[PDB]
Design a protein around this nucleic acid. Structure first.
Ligand SMILES: [Mg+2]
Ligand SMILES: [Mg+2]
Ligand SMILES: [Mg+2]
Ligand SMILES: [Mg+2]
Ligand SMILES: [Mg+2]
Ligand SMILES: [Mg+2]
Ligand SMILES: [Mg+2]
Ligand SMILES: [Mg+2]
Ligand SMILES: [Mg+2]
Ligand SMILES: [Mg+2]
Ligand SMILES: [Mg+2]
Ligand SMILES: [Mg+2]
Ligand SMILES: [Mg+2]
Ligand SMILES: [Mg+2]
Ligand SMILES: [Mg+2]
Ligand SMILES: [Mg+2]
Ligand SMILES: [Mg+2]
Ligand SMILES: [Mg+2]
Ligand SMILES: [Mg+2]
Ligand SMILES: [Mg+2]
Ligand SMILES: [Mg+2]
Ligand SMILES: [Mg+2]
Ligand SMILES: [Mg+2]
Ligand SMILES: [Mg+2]
Ligand SMILES: [Mg+2]
Ligand SMILES: [Mg+2]
Ligand SMILES: [Mg+2]
Ligand SMILES: [Mg+2]
Ligand SMILES: [Mg+2]
Ligand SMILES: [Mg+2]
Ligand SMILES: [Mg+2]
Ligand SMILES: [Mg+2]
Ligand SMILES: [Mg+2]
Ligand SMILES: [Mg+2]
Ligand SMILES: [Mg+2]
Ligand SMILES: [Mg+2]
Ligand SMILES: [Mg+2]
Ligand SMILES: [Mg+2]
Ligand SMILES: [Mg+2]
Ligand SMILES: [Mg+2]
Ligand SMILES: [Mg+2]
Ligand SMILES: [Mg+2]
Ligand SMILES: [Mg+2]
Ligand SMILES: [Mg+2]
Ligand SMILES: [Mg+2]
Ligand SMILES: [Mg+2]
Ligand SMILES: [Mg+2]
Ligand SMILES: [Mg+2]
Ligand SMILES: [Mg+2]
Ligand SMILES: [Mg+2]
Ligand SMILES: [Mg+2]
Ligand SMILES: [Mg+2]
Ligand SMILES: [Mg+2]
Ligand SMILES: [Mg+2]
Ligand SMILES: [Zn+2]
Lengths: 209, 100, 100, 50, 128
RNA sequence: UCAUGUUCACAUACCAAACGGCGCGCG
RNA sequence: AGAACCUUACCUGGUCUUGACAUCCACGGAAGUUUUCAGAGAUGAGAAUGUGCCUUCGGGAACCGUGAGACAGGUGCUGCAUGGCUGUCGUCAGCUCGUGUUGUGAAAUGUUGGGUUAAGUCCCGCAACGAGCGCAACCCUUAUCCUUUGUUGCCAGCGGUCCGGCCGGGAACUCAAAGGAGACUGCCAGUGAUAAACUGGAGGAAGGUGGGGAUGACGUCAAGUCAUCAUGGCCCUUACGACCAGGGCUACACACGUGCUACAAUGGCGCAUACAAAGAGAAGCGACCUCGCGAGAGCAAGCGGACCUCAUAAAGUGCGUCGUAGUCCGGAUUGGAGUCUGCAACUCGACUCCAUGAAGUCGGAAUCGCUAGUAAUCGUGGAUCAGAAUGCCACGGUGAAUACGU
């Protein structure tokens, strides 16, 4: 019953775009490729620093990255040694002057991407999938999500038959376009294969737009 | 010798914000900007197959909408031209200042 | 796509970039109605001599991520599946689902 | 005003450890020279030295 | 004189009707009614409102119409004329509405749908 | 009036004010 | 969403083996350049030009070459090990939970009953009371109006005119977007359990979800995809990896699916002539003029575009002809001549011209779509793309028949 992607169905309405720049068709593909590169590099580097959302925004032949992250202190390092290194590598990849900004995620128990990452990490290091998932749901509800759903899928506990299990708490109105549903995915590369994690977090119902 | 400014953006709210800002700059700096005229939006539609392999009728139709705004300023003064040059706009809105 | 396939594509692109001026010159000579028959013949033979992968019509557009040689879209430089993934995540600015 | 008696690319940047054209604002870029205006990103302390 | 205006619209047509007292003249894009619409149905439809509200030998009409084709354009003109008449008199709303001319006919064209050969025709089906 | 359907196989389970005159005054 | 080469994964032959693609060292060399012979090419041998950016200068980094291995590589197998993505029942109205109660228990009840609704929609009842995912709404588009603004768009009223909105101008109108208003069974009468609703009518551009889209519950089919990608296991590693030229994927006794074009006069042909919408464009769209029967060629404005180009809508309308013929229907097929793209159109492109002029006279059993701007019919555009659509995705023109009923 394949469901529409909640972010993509909500862009414009309640949700913003991650990349926010204009380009004509001459420069569009190149810009997209560069963004892909920068995002890939940044994720590879800052896998341990908990990174929720890279937001690329290029004006005037210059790139401005904005890393939404749970631990700024770890992204910045002391005196900004690592941010500076990152900035320069991003600049080389793009081919323009770079500028990195860092947005601090205060509640990473409500940030879907972060939650998914945590669950996947636990799965990889062989925690009980069910336990990890339950903990994730409880924590989000405790922090004050209006609702949360978590789904894990495939070869759970190294079982020969794959199956998907999911827990829901509160309300998660997926068909409501004005519903602020944060959503993301991750993949646990276990010894028996890939295990997919999806996480929906209903923050509330935005009425402004 | 009027300065023409073409604003192009994917978001319409942003284009409105930019154009209003430009208008404010002109009207403050003493100039006769004609008006923020909305040119037509380009709805560039794309249609892709959603399945990784067969099933042809399963498809998604996306579209990018480019919004246009023509703002002309009549009589370029010193203050006006220099102000225009100084003022940098929002990143997500491509501006094109054609003098003539 | 295979690594080899991707490499082949890059090689073709590089060759095309290299030999563009020369090939254009030869073609112009061959086309030119106001030109000698012997010269034209020589030009045709020279063009044959040049490497085949210098010809732009040799290089296939492939997804810039996966290398997929079908379902390509020039504006994005990506095959349909990757375009969809990016669009849903919000990676392609301005793009969203279209209805009318 | 650039190439005047204060031009940040002649003498050095005004902001503490960050550049004038705005392109770079972190110690990682320390010692790069931009190509928007041409300033060197470095210690603003050296603006009194050069 | 007074010049009473009305915008007509139908399928993709858009008429500009300028009513003016006088003889029963119709000018559609600097052409006679018969010249422009060399069609009986079209002519009938553009006349129709005037015949209903006895002003056929009473009014000039300067028209300009853009878009659509013959039938749509005629419909648009009819709508415009009725609107203009209402502007001019405003007592005629009842007769005109009863006739059914005040209603803007909102039928346009159903878009073509992925999967479908047309708006609704699906391609021919088989079991085997 | 409507017969039939081969075998075996079902997963999950506790970043803090700056520099010069002119003065008056204190010492 | 496009196989001549490429693509390409297949075959044949020719070749390579730390490798086409990475990191790592070692040490010899700036990169790059320019040509030559042999070769189908992959390459293998040569001959020339440069031999440079930055060093605290014991050299580095950009970039080749050679040697060692660790490794690379695999469009190899398993979709019945998987993620992700998708079809499907089905845009069907359903699927559950907490607590309570009932039952030894699987379970039940809620979630049935009376009505009503497109709807588990709503009201009423009721050992249930609540909640969730679905319905609905929120989103896009279309139909009416209003405010704002007016070029590249508009021309109502003014003067001018080369009678062209073309130029002074105007901001009215169309239109262009942005923001508002509007439709809610809101008002009226009746029916109805003092109901939810239903039947009509009033106004209104729109009336009962206004039209159309997006939106696809829990799940089903060990459904589809290991060849987009990723990925567990397995397998190959002087070869199931890599490079090349040529061929194949376009074969043809035959069988089926989906289409196009027809069998004609509601038509073919000729001449004149009207009315669209939506798109695309810089290694691009290409005007004008000249040449060519034509496809096209030469020159060459413009224009990242409400400006310029693609770009002449066609069906229609008028006049003529044909007069029911295998025809002035039909265009397959083949011969000759060409054009363009392209290193290259033999296999195997598209198109043009001249010739040719098959079958086919409305299609057996059977079977499909469609309820309204729909079907039918007519053209137009786009993606992919050097070239290569009758397919796909969009756009407008004309515009029906019928629905008694289950
Ligand atoms: Mg699924
Ligand atoms: Mg879907
Ligand atoms: Mg690969
Ligand atoms: Mg090609
Ligand atoms: Mg006139
Ligand atoms: Mg089928
Ligand atoms: Mg038997
Ligand atoms: Mg049986
Ligand atoms: Mg057995
Ligand atoms: Mg081939
Ligand atoms: Mg390997
Ligand atoms: Mg492999
Ligand atoms: Mg493998
Ligand atoms: Mg399966
Ligand atoms: Mg699967
Ligand atoms: Mg299979
Ligand atoms: Mg198996
Ligand atoms: Mg219960
Ligand atoms: Mg039920
Ligand atoms: Mg029950
Ligand atoms: Mg009931
Ligand atoms: Mg409900
Ligand atoms: Mg009940
Ligand atoms: Mg709904
Ligand atoms: Mg409308
Ligand atoms: Mg006028
Ligand atoms: Mg009425
Ligand atoms: Mg009514
Ligand atoms: Mg199977
Ligand atoms: Mg595998
Ligand atoms: Mg396979
Ligand atoms: Mg293999
Ligand atoms: Mg080959
Ligand atoms: Mg071939
Ligand atoms: Mg084939
Ligand atoms: Mg059949
Ligand atoms: Mg057929
Ligand atoms: Mg047909
Ligand atoms: Mg004929
Ligand atoms: Mg015909
Ligand atoms: Mg001629
Ligand atoms: Mg355009
Ligand atoms: Mg065309
Ligand atoms: Mg005709
Ligand atoms: Mg005739
Ligand atoms: Mg016969
Ligand atoms: Mg006959
Ligand atoms: Mg028939
Ligand atoms: Mg229906
Ligand atoms: Mg058609
Ligand atoms: Mg195409
Ligand atoms: Mg093409
Ligand atoms: Mg298709
Ligand atoms: Mg149509
Ligand atoms: Zn800078």
């Amino acid at each position: 019953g394949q469901k529409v992607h909640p972010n993509g169905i909500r862009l414009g309405i309640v949700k913003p775009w991650n990349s926010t720049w204009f380009a004509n068709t001459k420069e569009f593909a190149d810009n997209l490729d560069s963004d892909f590169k920068v995002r890939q590099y940044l994720t590879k580097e800052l896998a341990k620093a908990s990174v929720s959302r890279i937001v690329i925004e290029r004006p005037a032949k210059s790139i401005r990255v904005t890393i939404h992250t749970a631990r700024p202190g770890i992204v910045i390092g002391k005196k900004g040694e690592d941010v500076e290194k990152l900035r320069k590598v991003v600049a080389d990849i793009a081919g323009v002057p770079a500028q990195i900004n860092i947005a601090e995620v205060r509640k990473p128990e409500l940030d879907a991407k972060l939650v998914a990452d945590s669950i996947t990490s636990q799965l990889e290091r062989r925690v009980m999938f069910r336990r990890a998932m339950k903990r994730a749901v409880q924590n989000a509800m405790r922090l004050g999500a209006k609702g949360i759903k978590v789904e894990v899928s495939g070869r759970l506990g190294g079982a020969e038959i794959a199956r998907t299990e999911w827990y829901r708490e509160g309300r998660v109105p997926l068909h409501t376009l004005r519903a602020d549903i944060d959503y993301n995915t991750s993949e646990a590369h276990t010894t028996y294969g890939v295990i997919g994690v999806k996480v929906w977090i209903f923050k509330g119902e935005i009425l402004g737009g | 010798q009027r300065i023409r400014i073409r604003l192009k953006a994917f978001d319409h709210r942003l284009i409105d914000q930019a154009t209003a800002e430009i208008v404010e700059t002109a009207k403050r700096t003493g100039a006769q900007v004609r008006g923020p005229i909305p040119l037509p939006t380009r709805k560039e539609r794309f249609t892709v197959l959603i399945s990784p392999h067969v099933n042809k009728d399963a498809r998604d139709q996306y579209e990018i909408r480019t919004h246009l705004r023509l703002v002309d300023i009549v009589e370029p003064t010193e203050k006006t031209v220099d102000a225009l040059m100084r003022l940098d706009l929002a990143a997500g809105v491509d501006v094109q200042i054609s003098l003539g | 796509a295979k690594q080899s396939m991707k490499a082949r594509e890059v090689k073709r692109v590089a060759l095309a970039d290299k030999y563009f001026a020369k090939r254009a010159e030869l073609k112009a000579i061959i086309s030119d109605v106001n030109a000698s028959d012997e010269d034209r013949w020589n030009a045709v033979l020279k063009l044959q001599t040049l490497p085949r992968d210098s010809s732009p019509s040799r290089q296939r557009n492939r997804c810039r991520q996966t290398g997929r040689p079908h379902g390509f879209l020039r504006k994005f430089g990506l095959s349909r599946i990757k375009v969809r993934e990016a669009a849903m995540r919000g990676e392609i600015p301005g793009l969203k689902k279209a209805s009318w | 005003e650039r190439d005047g008696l204060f031009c940040a690319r002649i003498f050095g940047p005004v902001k503490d450890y960050e550049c004038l054209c705005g392109k770079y604002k972190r110690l990682k870029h320390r010692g790069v020279i931009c190509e928007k205006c041409g300033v060197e990103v470095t210690q603003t302390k050296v603006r009194r030295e050069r | 004189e007074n010049q009473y205006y009305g915008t007509g619209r139908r399928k993709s047509s858009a008429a500009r009707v300028f009513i003016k007292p006088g003889n029963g003249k119709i000018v559609i894009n600097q052409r006679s009614l018969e010249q422009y619409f060399g069609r009986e149905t079209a002519r009938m439809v553009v006349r129709q409102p005037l015949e209903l509200v006895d002003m056929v030998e009473k009014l000039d009409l300067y028209i300009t119409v853009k878009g659509g084709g013959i039938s749509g354009q005629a419909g648009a003109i009819r709508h415009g004329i009725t609107r203009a008449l209402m502007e001019y008199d405003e007592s005629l709303r009842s007769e005109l509405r009863k006739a059914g001319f005040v209603t803007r006919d909102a039928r346009q064209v159903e878009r073509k749908k992925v999967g479908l050969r047309k708006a609704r025709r699906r391609p021919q089906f088989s079991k085997r």
